[PDB]
Each structure stands twice: as C-alpha cells, then as structure tokens.
C-alpha cells in the first residue's frame, strides 16, 4: 500500500500559537483512499528544512501534501523550497500575475510588488486556482507521483483540495462514515440503548461524540457495513436523531419553516446575537426570519416588551416566555425564540452557570425548556442557542 | 545552532481523532533553551516506522521528546521502536515491575500480563517516576544526546517532564516574543511598511499571521533584540495596531467603553447576531453593551430606523451610517456599531459578495469604511464583525 505523507507549513503551528487542524482533516479525508498514512509532519517556515522535508517526503511518496507558506512576506516560502527539492528554477507567469494585479485593482489598491512571488511557478507545477484570496495552488505530477500545495486558510483550501482530489487518480478503497446527531440524551442511554449493535471491530465501528448540539454517533469502517449497521441505529435511535451528515439544526429549522410558509424573530439577552448569528449561518435565511433583539440591558428589555414586573428576575421560565412572547408581537412572526439565563463565570440571582431557559412562542401558545448545561461561558453560550434551535425540530 | 525533535505518537493523532496538543506544549517549554525546533512530528503506532523517524530524529538532533506509546497495549510500541532505533536492548526491571503490580493491587486487582512491558528499559536509560500512572518513562543520554520518553496523558507527563528539563543540561538563552495585533493593513503592505525592520535572521526573528480578526504581527527570539525590533515595529504600523499578546478586539472595545465610561448597541443585518454574540463574549460585556438589533427583512430595517429611501440601497455607506446614527438613538448609547453588506453567495443590488459597510456613530459624528472581502459566507460575516470592532480601536 503506498504512503501519503502530509506537511503543514509554519513556525506558529509548532508552538500551538495556531491548533494545527489542516494535517489531520486533509489525512481524514485521504480515508477513502488506499494510501497510507504513517506519519504527519508541522514543519518551520525556513526554506532549506521545509525543502529537505519536502525531498524526503517525495522519495517515500505516492502523495505528498503541503498547506501554508504560500503568501506574499518573507515567511512564506512553501514554492521556494519545494523547487529546491525538486530541482526545477522558478518561472514568473504572466496570466496570474495579470489575475492577482486585478484582484488589488477591484480594491482601488495598488498591488504591492512583493506579491509577485505568488505568481511563481515549476515546469511541471499546474494551477490549483484560488478565487477567495491572492495565492493560488501547485499540482506536481512527476514521475508517477503527486504534490499538492495548498493555502493555509481552511477557507481557501477546502474547496481547492475539493475539486483537485478526485482528478489525482488514487486507488480507491470502499470506505464510509455515516455521523446520526440526537439530542437531549447522553452517552451512557446512547450506549444501552444500542446494546449489540455498538459494535467495535476492524471492519466497521460505532462511536459517542459529545458536541454542543447534543450527542453524535458515528459509524465508520468499510462501506458496506457502515450502510447496514447505520441503518439499524438510526431504527433503534428514531425518537432521538434529528438530522445525519451535513444536517445541522439551523437547517432542519430553515426547511420547517419553508414547509410552513412561517417566519420567525428571535429576543436573547444571555447568547448576545449568537442565535440570530446561527439562524442566518444557513443560505437562503432571510426567507423566513425576519430580525432579533439582542436585549443585553434591562433598558433594552423593557424598551422592547417584556414586562417591568419581570426585570429584576432574569432567570426564569416566566421572563423566557415574555421574551419569546414580546419578539413575535413586536416583528410579527408566526414563531419567536427566547433565551435567557447564567452564562458564566458568575452566578446570578442565586443560580449557578449554566441555568439556562430557552422559549418558542408560536400560534397555539408558547413553550419553555429548563436546562443546566456543563461548561464555560462560550460553551454555554452555544448550547443555549443549539436548544432554543431544538424546541423547534425535536 | 543545535537542533531540538518532537515526536507525539498515536495514530489517533495523525486523524485529530485526539487532539496533539503535546507536540506544541512540549516546543513551548523549550523556549527558553538555544535550540532551534524546525519541525514537529505525529506517527502511527507502527514500530518499523516509528523506529526509523526516532532513528533519523536522533542522528540530526541534540534532544529528542517522545510522547505517549507507553501503553500496555499491542498498540503501545514506543519502547520497542526507540530500542530497535537506537541499537540497544530491552531489559526487564524487576523494581519497577515490582511498583507496577503495587499499582494494580491499590485498585484491589491483579496486574494484567501486558502490563509487563511497562517495566522494559534499554541500558542507556535512567527511570522517570509517573506518580500519576502506570508507565514510567525514560531518560537516555548517548552520543552527547538527550532522547526522552514521556507517557501521552498530560496530567502524568508534565510533572515529568518539568522534573526532567532542568536536568538535561541543555544551553540556555534569554528568549522573549511579542505579539502586535493590526487590523486595515495588508500583509504585502506591513512587508513594504517595515521594510530593513522584517529581520529573518538565527537570533531573531519577524513573521505575520493572517487572521480574520487582522493580521498578527510576532517577533520571537533573543530578548534584548525582541523588545528593540518590537518597539520600532509597533512605531512604524502605529494606527494599526490595536492590541498585543492575549488582547481581543472584544477586549480592547471594552478598555475603551470602561475607560471612558461609556455605552455601545449595535445593528447589524448580514452578520446576523455575530457582532452582539463576539461583543458579549467577554465576560463584563453587560456594563457598556445595552443590546442591539438584528434587522435582517425589510419590514425590521424600517421598524429600527433605516430610512425608506434607502430600503434599496442597503448595501452602501449611507445606509450604514444611518444604521448606526439609528441604533445609538434607539438605545440611548454613547456609540453604535452597524453592519451592512453582501455575505455571499449571491449578489445584491448588483453588488458581489464581500462588499460590506460598517459604521460607527458617536456625540462627534459617525464614520464609515468599506470593504471588499474574498472569502465564503462565513468569513466575509466575521470579517465584517472584526471589522466594525476595529472602528472603536483603529
Ligand atoms: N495547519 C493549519 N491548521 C489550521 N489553521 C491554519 C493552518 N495553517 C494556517 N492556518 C491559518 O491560516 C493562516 C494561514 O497562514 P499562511 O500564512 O501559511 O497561509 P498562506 O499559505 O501563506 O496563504 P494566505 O496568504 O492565503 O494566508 C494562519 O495564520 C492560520 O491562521
Ligand atoms: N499528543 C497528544 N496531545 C494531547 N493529548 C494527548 C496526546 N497523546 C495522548 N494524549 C492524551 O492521553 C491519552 C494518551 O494515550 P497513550 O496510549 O498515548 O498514552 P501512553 O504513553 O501509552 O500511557 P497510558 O497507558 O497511561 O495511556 C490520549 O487518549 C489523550 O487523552
Ligand atoms: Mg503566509
Ligand atoms: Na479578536
Ligand atoms: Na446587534
């Protein structure tokens, strides 16, 4: 079976200073593929050791990979050394400094003569184009063998990486992973629930990932297992699974409210806007929601329709309900989501982090949902707006 | 300058299955010893490979840290692949081995026979206590060379590892590194702006990180030389930068609105949320930020004050000053934030995705600036967020 090796570029991913996340998602998505994977390298940006790296990795290789170092400063030599390791001289073309000089133009900027460097390439090197940014990728095929530089940014380089993997021409292997995400129930029931079917072997296996928007289970191995087996989790688990793969709350909400023909507002006081930021996360929103009140102060509250008898006494099922109730008559939607609680680090009115209400109000009347959710400030946060999200799809 | 290897190992690593924090914590600690990190390395619990690169690591370096492989399991190979690397055999401790059966006689049980290899040592090795655990490490010394092994849990290895650092009698030199934090300048541009002052040299050093909340400007190295090339570098991008070190842009709105005793709202329509959600993240967020609106249909954007003439022109600069000049008298604040904009993928009033606005309004006047950013969806609405920040802090 031959190797894949994996290099990610840059002296702040040796220290941690940036999680280096590239290495490992571009290996899990090498799965389907018959190459191995022995090892994953974080590599300085200093051209002679990025280029001895470069020239060992290419010798043992099938596929070798690099992200980051592909910028216009003197920390960015990724192509520099990669020539160096494969002998070849750096050749200016013209098309893609043209590109890059009318990316800056668009801008009423002029381009900086550094950024010429970007449009640097080898004789075998083909483009790898990048329309979200300024540095576009190589594709080496040279002696039976592949070389892929990409940018640093996930946002430039996922779709980059997208379109060039398939075309490489790798043996296949018949790998799947299916993820099934619940909520309101944790590991343990999970695992009991399944009983048998929580198998662990070197075919298939299933597996418990707690997340912010409630417990996934994911099931990976040979495809062909992966499909049986799934099929019968997602039957034991029927009550609790709400969405598989891509599926997230936002947009199993999103489709309810198509189906429907119904808008939706949103009040928050302890989230600050990340519910509304989640509802919109999702294409195609503002067909159906039509605004939110962040109502941070007890100003803004009243201001805004809750009712001054409920201001001294945030944490509430009777202050979530009169925000959800107060957002729907003020924007006129058919349903409104309200959250309202402690965040963190401190407690407030007696209660401890982590006392959440969420609340919908729709035609037939409204409803409020008590949670006491682990972790810190942020991680509360997001769990609030997952479940304000779920009193609506669960 | 002599060289410093690290290599965690688990195959989980390589597939961020686990999450390799230890490479990088491990890196860290070195820091204040003259030795020159140039990569970091994750490798499969295979003992042939793991061998070789602890083979190779170990001929090019003056210290070598391995992490985690410590196990019982037949998954757990470090020992054997350092003895095969190095030419050495493994040897049985009964003392040790003897500690280990004490271990599970503690929980009331009887060792388990894998548990044997844990007592292995090759000659050149002196024991590293884990009082935390079942696998001790080792300390080998060879060749004027240091290679540790260190168990993968971090509650048993750090202990460990800070016992042993000092002990290893590696050269050490005064290091220190400064992080400036810029928001509207370009990398090309900070290049070309510090010129003779963007030193890559053995003593020091100068790199830029691009963020989407701007890009980071760090010198690292010899600390005489750090605070020097720090001090003239923050004179130089003097408007631009707006924070060093740990310092949020979240942060540093809320030293301004404290230090002068003021209050903030927002009103945002393409982020959504996500500048209330990134200002109330910083905990204390409740004593300047009275709350904000999310006007995402039109109907919300003339219910909070976008003038009816400019309800088909959102996308410019005058609807965003007016956003702002709104949300300030709608709560009563000193200031107010506002975003405007095309977040993608599709175009608006025929503007591309990207173009955005984003306002300030205060007692003196409002401002606004306009961007056209690259990126997806997603980055063009934090792009947006981390930009009306930077309003308040240039
Ligand atoms: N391996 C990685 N994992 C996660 N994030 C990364 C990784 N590499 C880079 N990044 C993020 O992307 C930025 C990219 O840095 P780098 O300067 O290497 O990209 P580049 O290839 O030069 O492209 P660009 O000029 O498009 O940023 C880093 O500051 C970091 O924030
Ligand atoms: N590189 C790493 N970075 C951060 N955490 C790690 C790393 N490696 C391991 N860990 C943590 O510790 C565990 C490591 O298990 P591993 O088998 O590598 O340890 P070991 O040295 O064999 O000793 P033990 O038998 O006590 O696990 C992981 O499951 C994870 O929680
Ligand atoms: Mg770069
Ligand atoms: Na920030
Ligand atoms: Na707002």
Redesign the interface.
Known sequence: MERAEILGV????????????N???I??SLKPYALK??????????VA?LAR?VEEAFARARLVVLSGGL?????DVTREAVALALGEPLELDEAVLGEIEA?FR??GRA?????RKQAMRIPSATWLKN???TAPGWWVRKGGKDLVLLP??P??WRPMWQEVLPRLGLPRRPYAERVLKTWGIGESEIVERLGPLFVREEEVEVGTYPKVHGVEVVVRGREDRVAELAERIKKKLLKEVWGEGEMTLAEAVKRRMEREGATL??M?SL???????????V?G??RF?????????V??KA?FGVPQDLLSRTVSAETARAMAEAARS???STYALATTGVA???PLEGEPPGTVYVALAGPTGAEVRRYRFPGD??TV?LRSVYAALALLVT
């Open positions: 840059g002296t702040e991913l040796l220290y941690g200073e940036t999680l280096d996340t290495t490992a998602e290996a899990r994977v022995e090892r994953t390298l974080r590599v300085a940006d200093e050791p790296e910028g216009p400063t003197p920390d990316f668009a801008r381009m900086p003569e550094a950024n329309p979200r940014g640093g940014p946002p430039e507002s949103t928050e989230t600050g806007g990340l519910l509304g930021a989640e509802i919109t996360r294409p929103a503002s929601y039509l605004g939110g009140v962040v109502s941070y102060s100003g803004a201001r003020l924007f006129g963190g680090p401190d400030r942020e946060r």
